[PDB]
Design a protein around this ligand. Structure first.
Ligand code: ZN
Ligand code: ZN
Ligand code: ZN
Ligand code: ZN
Length: 111
């Protein structure tokens, strides 16, 4: 559920501003370092699932980086929170793709 920085978007490629309340708190800018939050200007526009996340049905990781196949991707359901390979699902249906987050949909069980 907790996502990571995509490193590609307009927010990610932007350097730390050094002047917002989150930058001023960082140790590198002479602050106490207790907040541990990113620069306000670097809040990822499309956060991704961590590489350690596995399919609920087969227990394997996302294999799309090598396979280049949608069914080998990991998809997270924004309704039931289940993380599966579309190909591991035993019923019909395309589900409903979420355009706000990557690897996110309303799965064929929920939609
Ligand atoms: Zn900043
Ligand atoms: Zn990003
Ligand atoms: Zn699977
Ligand atoms: Zn679902």
């Amino acid at each position: 559920m907790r996502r990571v920085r995509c490193r590609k978007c307009k927010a990610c490629v932007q350097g730390e501003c050094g002047v917002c309340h989150y930058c001023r708190d960082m140790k590198k800018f002479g602050g106490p370092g207790r907040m541990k939050q990113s620069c306000v200007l670097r809040q990822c526009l499309a956060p991704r699932l961590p590489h350690s996340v596995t399919c609920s049905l087969c227990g394997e990781v996302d294999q799309n980086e090598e396979t280049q196949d949608f069914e080998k991707k990991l998809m997270e359901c924004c309704i039931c929170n289940e993380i599966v390979h579309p190909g591991c699902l035993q019923m019909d249906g395309e589900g409903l793709l979420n355009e706000e987050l990557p690897n996110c949909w309303e799965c064929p069980k929920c939609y």
